[model samples]
Target chain A: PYASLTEIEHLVQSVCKSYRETCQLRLEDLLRQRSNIFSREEVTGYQRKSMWEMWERCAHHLTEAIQYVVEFAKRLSGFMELCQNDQIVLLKAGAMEVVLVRMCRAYNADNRTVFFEGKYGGMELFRALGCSELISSIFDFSHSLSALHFSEDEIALYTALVLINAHRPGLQEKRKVEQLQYNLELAFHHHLCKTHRQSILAKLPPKGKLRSLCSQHVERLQIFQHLHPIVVQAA
Target chain B: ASLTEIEHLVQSVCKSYRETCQLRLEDLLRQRSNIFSREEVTGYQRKSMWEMWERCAHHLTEAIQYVVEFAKRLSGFMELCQNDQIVLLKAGAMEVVLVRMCRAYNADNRTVFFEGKYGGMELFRALGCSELISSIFDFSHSLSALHFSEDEIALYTALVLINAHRPGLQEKRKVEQLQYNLELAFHHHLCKTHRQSILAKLPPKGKLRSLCSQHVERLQIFQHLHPIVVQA
Candidate 1:
């Protein structure tokens, strides 16, 4: 299938519309609840707490957000065309990477912070949490993407690029996947031609960090669970 | 198997909830030491206010995804009818989020770091809620002092999400049972951790309710003041 701007625009609109339909939460929700009636202070309390509380919040949110990615992916063109088994394979492999890409949406370049839960969390926040390198790497990728200040259309295109993988493992139908990916790349090329005339896409880190970054995240989760045996039994 | 079931819940809570990090409050102050000094308490312009609000909206919207996912992971969350799930989430998400806010709060300096900067009342003055900002700051301050563990915090969040009496809930009995199981699991968790102090330290739910109300009132007034900001 030949990719054209019109078709890409349709892709963008379709993707954006699906995104809008899924907007169960928004900034107005954040705006609505700012004041409460009571308050307090103590420095000694800060010294005694651990960072796992923040991690729990972070991990739960990450898992939850992945469900949204599935919803988003299902809305993409030709995504559901693949066999059911292959569909699961792609999501299992690609969902976290796509979620990482999606982080740029809520990332604030001005402060170098990614919004987590209700607050804009900075790299500094994640520095002390274990997996410092992995967190930093994710921030680095997010910052690189945010620096471009991509529009919604651009972000949607980039997300498609990340999601339609021809090389992911366990694909029985590689040719079908490659054809879709090629069409996406063509659309991406036209997008860049209209926007920039350089190797910006080529210059951008080749989805290399994401692969390892994801593995490290899983690795850390494994280590954490192993350290706490009760969690293993409970699961 | 009763306590074991409760134990299973606690461990699952621990597994589903793992260690994540945010900036240390102290680190935020040291890194951005120059900015607060440069800008006066009221130095913010309309553009800055818009950006601040935009970032909040952007981040908060993303945060909701996590809240929803967490509820879905609960043992019995999916068993509830869809309508009841919406009711529980709409009413309870913010409260649960606010409770989670203590993890990033800085009690000593009275600042909550967001968007990579240490935001005190002065920084939030543009939001036009001196009383409101302090109210939330104080609440986080108080809550931060308790020092909850992952299991306790997770169960507490579940308790908030599974509230049986949320307005318009369809199956109060089922929701109540879920909450009851969570409470027992939470109690066992504290006992296991040997921190019974937290049993009596349940945050005042009344405060969150009042805070949510105050926020609504303040947001309306702010919207009224700046139609363009809200409208745009």
Candidate 2:
């Protein structure tokens, strides 16, 4: 689809839209599976067997999502604009974080909670854990995402833009990545103009809040690793 | 109070909160949808920096405005005695915005579409407020992603407004009962909806306390920066 008409306004939105739709679909599949959100559940502080199970489960799901994110990018025509090296660079830097951010769409703060296929907890859920601060911070992050005014289509584009994950550490086609972002954003803004403009990413900010989720996961992973040092011990 | 009825009331208040925010925010943040060439750049002195500072201030006041309207529309919020009302408002104000942050987050590219098209992230960063603004943006995204129902919104925001935990309330039991009843209503709603697995999603209680402590730390950052980010 992206083989022709790289910058043509109509074509960019169409291609990016399809890409985001695919992303949205994958995002849902990941969320619906109870196993994908396993980190939020208390699988640690258990039997050595359970600890290993948790570690294995988390690694597996994260791998699946990151691969899916890369796979989605592979489908993008613009992604091919880069040489093999640039494409790999973009995917390598972006894979996990993009998946991390993409998953930000599923949160519910009425009671201060997180969810994937289902609710992450009730107030009592975290009562026994020593890790309340970190989890609560996660809720706080979830709470802030409770409301946004952006539509799904607009949000889809941003997902595409973030997937581009421009400003990599080193790149020959740094401009290329950014140019792709600019085109996608420009097309959306053009649409946003005629429509009433309000908070775009706020409704959207990772409303899947991937930034916060990544941080929360990182924090918890550290805690988990401390309790079960096997993660750090892996060379 | 009847929770569903209460939901309707808070929904209207929240709707006002969001609408007023949208109306004012639209004008305040509308940027031309294109980047300025460096040559077009005026010197980066106060002439510009002050404008961004003003932008920050405007955004803060815009937040304040959202809370003000939210408080005004909140049914029982103003009924509390003076000291109690102020305290609850302080907490409630923070809480509602926190919950509302997720309303309709556009997390994808975090761009703005004011004048034609422009980079909201770039704009905030140029204003030198990216870290904090992005934090607010992140909160909104989290909330949106959480996917609370309209009914859920009312319950949560009402909880924030009627919080018994706010200090200095002489009628502790009265406020406490309100808090109690609201929590009861929350569970009841969960039962009615058959979304009981949601109960599993709650963080442990130990987590909430420190979360509050963490919240206070962020509040401190907001207060320290408020002078620059808000009108005195």
Candidate 3:
């Protein structure tokens, strides 16, 4: 039987999240198996034979394609840990973001793309603002930035904004012309506010003005802000 | 009556007595084998490695027990003579007993002594040598003379060695030796003489299924021995 819309949405999100978790778990299992193999003193002929048989069986399984990606990601994670290269980490993070976006778009198909495109287009702007807020939020930005803290809702918003901006075209004369165009098209079709018509802002602070601007259009913005305070307290 | 003088007298007499006693024990052990004159070796069909292991295990156990007991008695005698007041006499007797025990232990347990790290090969070597001796005399094949390949011989040898001794010392080296011996034996059996015979004896998987099932496990084992690729 088909679930109600809300139930279906919840189920899809649960499945998507669970699938990612399963991928991580499988990667962990493979890592553990590899470690065990390496640590063994004398792997008997029989044991080697058995392990090869098992590998063949596992490789032949239909789920191996997905399992392989999980393994790849785990390997990438290990590489990142050793290399400490932000570019490589960013590549993997970007790939994950793309996958998440694609999954979200496919799940809803209508309203979700607006959200996806908005966040995708606004990522750089969001990052600039988020960085400024992060700088200001820190008790000691001159000596160290480790004191910086963002509530879960603020972090989520910041993540969404940064992810959106990463997908957008480059800025022209301090303004993202292509993003403004895309936003204009979306506003016309979805009856959204033409907010991008305003001047190209650089390093907009993520404090009072930005929060109010985002909240003026969407009631969810207030919910997000409220959620941020609670999250920050809990964290 | 001081301990120092008694120790000095004991040490001097004991050394000479042990040397003469060892020679006698060696001569006696050689004579005892003649008691079982009926046993002999003859040509027989080849058997698998597992079968040969079972056979070797029985004899190896007997050999180990004989040596262990002798070592214990020699150790006990040495202890007894340590405190004896009739220094020269007591030491002399103990020395002869110790030497005799060692000689007997070594002769009956020479397989163990020479076997060293290559205990399995030693067993096989013993079996082959025994068979060759029996053949020259035209005697029936004795249990000791049963033929086994290098691998089967090694496998059985290792099993017995691990059981008899503490696996704590030089275990990795022993395992490596055993593996080498086992592979050598398998190659000789499965690849050399019995290849055609084994192939012919297999059940027909039809013409198509034959290719699929033929030596599948062996092929996989070969791959495991040397992997073609390493995924990082």
Error of 1 at A165 (Å): 42
Residue A135, candidate 2: Cα error in Å is 4.0
DockQ, prediction 3: 0.01
lDDT of 2 by residue, B26-49 (tens): 332444335444432332222454
lDDT of 3: 0.27
> What are the DockQ scores of the candidates, in order?
0.01, 0.01, 0.01
The residue-by-residue lDDT of candidate 3 on A170-223, one tens digit each, is 222213333323332332222212323122223223334333322231222122
TM-score for candidate 3: 0.15
Top-DockQ candidate index: 1
Q: Evaluated with lDDT, which candidate comes out highest?
A: 1
Candidate 2 DockQ vs. native: 0.01
Best by TM-score: 1
Q: What is candidate 1's lDDT per residue for B18-83, written digit by digit as tens?
A: 422122334644644433443544454344555555555544434444555576567577677645
Error of 2 at A178 (Å): 2.6
lDDT of 1 by residue, A61-110 (tens): 55555656666666665676776445655765676677777677766666
iRMSD of all candidate structures: 17.2, 22.1, 29.2
Candidate 1 wrongly placed segments (more than 4 Å): A1-235, B19-36, B40-51, B216-232
Give lDDT per model, in order. 0.61, 0.50, 0.27
Candidate 2 docking classification: incorrect
